[PDB]
């Protein structure tokens, strides 16, 4: 074995699994998903004694998700995944990437963006954006940013938002609304008045999408870890001696809602 030395010993045999997912969305102005996909990787950080034979189990096809394709670390026995979908491997010590994967089916979209505009003649836009969190209420999203583009003839912006903070950034022609925490199954809204400069009648504005950034503590693909079994047949620790941890870190990629 080339990726693992033979004499490894730990008093505290511990492992950490990171399920790291980027969820991507393009949503139409009428609420139809135009395109959506998840890119994921599973990083393992193991401190295990000797040369353990590990088995990784997830909810691949109550909730069972569909993996469009994936690639593994060279340590994974591919032929075991080819006739039984069993991810078996002797892990390298420390941190390594166990697999990369891509999902498109039955994606959890953590946030819904509902915009609303009201052209007050040629002087101003009166606009309201509502975000809805669509996940278990016991979970918090963090680092939420809602990004609302403004026309290039904007002379000034007023905003009201009961939650978070919002600044107009004329350098970037966007209102940036930042929210530190939001729990699942909640609504928050921002109102903005956008005062306009005179502008060329013919030259119109193709309203760019409202876009979002967020971090959620679940896998938007729906992936759940079911087990990571550790079997070291020569040494006197067994599976239940191993201290095992999982965390899910789902982040936004392209997350754009068309107006």
């Amino acid at each position: 074995i080339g990726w693992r030395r033979e004499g490894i010993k730990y008093r505290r045999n511990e492992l950490f699994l990171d399920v790291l997912e980027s969820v991507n969305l393009l949503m139409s102005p009428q609420g139809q998903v135009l395109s959506a996909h998840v890119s994921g990787r599973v990083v393992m950080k193991s401190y295990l004694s000797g040369m353990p034979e590990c088995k990784f189990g997830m909810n691949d096809k109550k909730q069972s998700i569909a993996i469009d394709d994936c690639t593994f670390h060279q340590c994974v026995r591919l032929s075991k995944f080819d006739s039984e979908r069993s991810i078996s491997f002797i892990p390298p010590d420390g941190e390594f990437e166990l697999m990369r994967y891509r999902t498109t089916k039955d994606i959890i979209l953590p946030f819904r963006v509902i915009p609303l505009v009201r052209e007050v003649g040629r002087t101003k836009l009166e606009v309201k954006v509502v975000i809805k969190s669509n996940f278990k209420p016991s979970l918090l999203a963090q680092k939420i940013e809602v990004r609302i583009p403004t026309p290039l003839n904007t002379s000034g912006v007023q905003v009201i938002c009961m939650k978070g903070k919002a600044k107009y950034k004329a350098s970037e022609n966007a209102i940036v609304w930042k929210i530190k925490r939001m729990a699942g199954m909640k609504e928050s809204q921002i109102s903005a008045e956008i005062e306009l400069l005179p502008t060329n009648d013919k030259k119109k504005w193709a309203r760019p999408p409202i876009s979002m950034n967020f971090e959620v503590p679940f896998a938007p693909s729906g992936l759940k870890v079911r087990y990571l079994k550790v079997f070291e047949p020569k040494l006197n620790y067994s599976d239940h001696d191993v201290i095992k941890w999982v965390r899910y870190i789902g982040r936004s990629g392209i997350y754009e809602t068309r107006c």
Binding site: F16, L17, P217, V225, R226, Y227, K244, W245, V246, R247
Partner: peptide, 6 residues
Amino acid sequence: GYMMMS
């Protein structure tokens, strides 16, 4: 965050 695994 990290969760104890079953």
